[PDB]
Design a protein around this ligand. Structure first.
Ligand SMILES: Nc1ncnc2c1ncn2[C@@H]1O[C@H](CSCC[C@H](N)C(=O)O)[C@@H](O)[C@H]1O
Length: 247
């Protein structure tokens, strides 16, 4: 999961190519949910990347900690929020028992689980890691709503060279038994003579299939929002799944 080059050599570049509004709205949603859980709030960010959300959460008074399977992400996150709040650790290793009030997994981290069996294992570990009444926020990929185009992002190079850096990206459902998606990334920095291609296999990229899996993992309540706006799921390619553990 954390071994893909996108999250290692290109970890900092991953951040630069993520639209700012995407970060601001989803992070605000998380902080809103933390408030609705009371004070203090113990939060685990599963796949925290460079730790932007952990910073916002900790600045808001949340007892936020994170895990990521990428060594380069952990290093970047620890530089932002210190060493004790971030751990190199796979979501498949989660073994806490009731330690958190809110578990968050944004930006499709959960689909790096190995198939449905892997997803169910991780969701059950997340379920066990939450207190009774605790909640989870999982951002998923609904592959059937993926853009039907190869997308492109251009940004200036290390010394301001215009369009020196390009990413092309393609998301398509795979013809598999279980709903899954091939997420293809191409990275190029022309001035530095860098060219990377990489094909991420993402498992259970279907909002209805994911919700049913969340139920099977033990969550009493499961809600799918179209976005941080909290509208009902309709056409979003990256809806938000909110789950609650029974009392
Ligand atoms: N099995 C796994 N366990 C923990 N983290 C994983 C993982 N597989 C992939 N990841 C991590 O999940 C991230 C997916 S992209 C991260 C962006 C996301 N918006 C965020 O919260 O930061 C990467 O940092 C990658 O290293």
């Amino acid at each position: 999961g954390g071994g893909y080059h996108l999250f290692n050599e290109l970890a900092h570049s991953y951040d630069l190519h993520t639209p700012p509004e995407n970060f601001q709205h989803d992070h605000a949603f998380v902080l809103e949910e933390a408030r609705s859980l009371g004070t203090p709030c113990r939060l685990l960010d599963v796949g925290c990347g460079t730790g932007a959300l952990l910073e916002k959460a900790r600045n808001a008074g949340i007892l936020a900690t994170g895990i990521d399977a990428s060594p380069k992400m952990v290093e970047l996150a620890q530089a932002r929020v210190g060493q004790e709040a971030v751990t190199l650790r796979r979501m498949e290793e989660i073994d806490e028992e009731g330690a958190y009030d809110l578990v968050v997994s944004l930006c499709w981290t959960i689909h790096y689980s190995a198939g449905r069996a892997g997803l169910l294992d991780v969701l059950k570990r997340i379920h066990r890691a939450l207190r009774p009444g605790g909640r989870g926020i999982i951002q998923i990929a609904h592959a059937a709503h993926a853009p039907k185009r190869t997308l492109e992002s251009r940004i200036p190079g290390p010394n301001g060279e215009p369009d020196d850096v390009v990413m092309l990206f393609r998301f398509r459902p795979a013809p598999t038994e279980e709903p899954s998606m091939h997420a293809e990334y191409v990275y190029a920095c022309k001035s530095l003579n860098e060219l990377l291609y990489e094909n991420h296999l993402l498992s259970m990229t279907d909002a209805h299939a994911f919700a049913a899996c969340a139920r099977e993992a033990g969550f009493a309540q499961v809600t799918v929002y179209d976005s941080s706006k909290r509208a009902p799921f309709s056409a979003a390619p990256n809806p938000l799944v909110c789950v609650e553990k029974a009392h």
